[PDB]
UniProtKB/Swiss-Prot annotation:
Involved in the homologous recombination repair (HRR) pathway of double-stranded DNA breaks arising during DNA replication or induced by DNA-damaging agents. Bind to single-stranded DNA (ssDNA) and has DNA-dependent ATPase activity. Part of the RAD51 paralog protein complex BCDX2 which acts in the BRCA1-BRCA2-dependent HR pathway. Upon DNA damage, BCDX2 acts downstream of BRCA2 recruitment and upstream of RAD51 recruitment. BCDX2 binds predominantly to the intersection of the four duplex arms of the Holliday junction and to junction of replication forks. It comes from Homo sapiens. Its main location: nucleus. This is DNA repair protein RAD51 homolog 4. GO terms for biological process: DNA repair; DNA strand invasion; double-strand break repair via homologous recombination; interstrand cross-link repair; reciprocal meiotic recombination; regulation of cell cycle; telomere maintenance; telomere maintenance via recombination. Disulfide bonds: none annotated. The lineage of its organism: Eukaryota, Metazoa, Chordata, Craniata, Vertebrata. The gene is RAD51D. One of its GO terms (cellular component) is replication fork. The chain holds residues 111 to 219 of 328 of the full protein. Belongs to the RecA family. RAD51 subfamily. It is linked to Breast-ovarian cancer, familial, 4: A condition associated with familial predisposition to cancer of the breast and ovaries. Characteristic features in affected families are an early age of onset of breast cancer (often before age 50), increased chance of bilateral cancers (cancer that develop in both breasts, or both ovaries, independently), frequent occurrence of breast cancer among men, increased incidence of tumors of other specific organs, such as the prostate. The keyword Nucleotide-binding applies. Keywords: ATP-binding, Chromosome, Cytoplasm, Cytoskeleton, DNA damage, DNA recombination, DNA repair, DNA-binding, Nucleotide-binding, Nucleus, Telomere.
Length: 109
DNA sequence: CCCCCCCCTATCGAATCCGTCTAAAGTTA
């Protein structure tokens, strides 16, 4: 319906319209960089601006609950350790799909 | 006590008439 498209457009806006770091957790494989490039072109036309906006987007793959927990705990630890600094922090993190990695566990007794 | 789905079938039933054309052959004082 709309979930991945809305997430991608919001991430593109936050990465370009505010100049902040954003992490994306893609689990179902629903993230193509061509869509992000199209959205950025729809926003602005400078190539270096698009490259800099893309450099603030980090994508990680986690196809089960354990990998997702590992990457989230790694982010927690690194941010809690890096509280002294004031640059490169992540303000928005998007999980592409939580049902993908949770549904296999459920079902039964 | 907990959380998610399935599938097509089978033929029926007849109606309605129209429009005319072509003449030929003399006979017996
Ligand atoms: N130019 C375009 N590029 C990409 N998607 C487009 C475009 N124009 C329209 N769309 C729509 O974007 C939708 C993408 O769906 P999306 O992946 O965001 O939904 P979803 O609910 O998160 O899906 P899923 O359950 O498969 O993860 C398509 O249904 C398509 O109709
Ligand atoms: Mg999707």
């Amino acid at each position: 319906s709309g979930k991945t498209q809305v997430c991608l457009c919001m991430a593109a806006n936050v990465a370009h319209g505010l100049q902040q770091n954003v992490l994306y957790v893609d689990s179902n494989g629903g993230l193509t960089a061509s869509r992000l490039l199209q959205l950025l072109q729809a926003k602005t036309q400078d190539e270096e601006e698009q490259a800099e906006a893309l450099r603030r987007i980090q994508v990680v793959h986690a196809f089960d609950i354990f990998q997702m927990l590992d990457v989230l705990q790694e982010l927690r630890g690194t941010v809690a350790q890096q509280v002294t600094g004031s640059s490169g922090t992540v303000k928005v993190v998007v999980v592409d799909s939580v049902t993908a990695v949770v549904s296999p566990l459920l079902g039964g007794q």
